Design a binder for this molecule. Sequence first.
Ligand SMILES: COc1cccc(C(=O)n2cccc2)c1
Ligand SMILES: [Mg+2]
Lengths: 151, 151
Amino acid sequence: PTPVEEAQQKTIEAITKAINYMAKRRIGALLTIERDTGMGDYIETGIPLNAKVSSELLINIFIPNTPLHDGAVIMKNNEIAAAACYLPLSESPFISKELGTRHRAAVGISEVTDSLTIIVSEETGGVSVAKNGDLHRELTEEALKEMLEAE
Amino acid sequence: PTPVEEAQQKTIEAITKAINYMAKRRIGALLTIERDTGMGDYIETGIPLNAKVSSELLINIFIPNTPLHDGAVIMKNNEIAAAACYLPLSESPFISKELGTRHRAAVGISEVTDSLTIIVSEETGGVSVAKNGDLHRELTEEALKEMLEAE
Ligand SMILES: COc1cccc(C(=O)n2cccc2)c1
Ligand SMILES: [Mg+2]
């Protein structure tokens, strides 16, 4: 594999390890991966990080009662661009009624970009992904990893 | 002021805001600012960030009982280079005997570099600075700012 491909694999490994840990601990999380539609307008609403990705940094961002935990992390390739970002809220009727703002924000950004957003529920620990206006819930660890690899 | 001057002042303000937050909550912290002596060997022992400085990120790094909080943050060229870094423990017999390994690590790096290290005590929330092999204890906010500006 090329350096670009190896870097992508390392970033996938960092994301999945972080998400798997937050799911086990019921740590709510909202992580949007920019794709070909630029998300600068949303990145600029958060706290700039421009940080190398690591599982450790991803988890710490979302620890409850901390400055960075409310709002979305937006990643650009192999960097965490910003945290505590605003995303627009979807009004889609296909969002389970019991779900809160993180899931609605994820679907919302997925309606106006080609990004992939991962959500961890603080209520159940369930992991979901929003893409192209659809929310896919209750993902296994294997399914999430495959989704990211395909992305 | 010049761009460089404004950037230095912004970073000092971000540091002092984070230190004040951790002192109030008695969150142990260890933050070393690289100066003329290169610290790459110590940076390489931690988790790479190369992140923009913010008080928010500093606070979200230093969360008790997290891997990212286990060691020193090292700053270089107005960025957070890495977190959870190793620093050498001082063997000086002239450090206050009630202080533990955090303060000995700060003094230790200050014995072999021209860096400035800030320490927040998890026992008391007291703020200290290590430079040139000495520990300056029980600093006020004004005292810490003066040290950062002098540095
Ligand atoms: C010690 O419990 C914690 C608490 C918060 C964050 C982490 C962490 O950074 N990781 C967990 C698995 C890989 C990375 C661990
Ligand atoms: Mg299902």
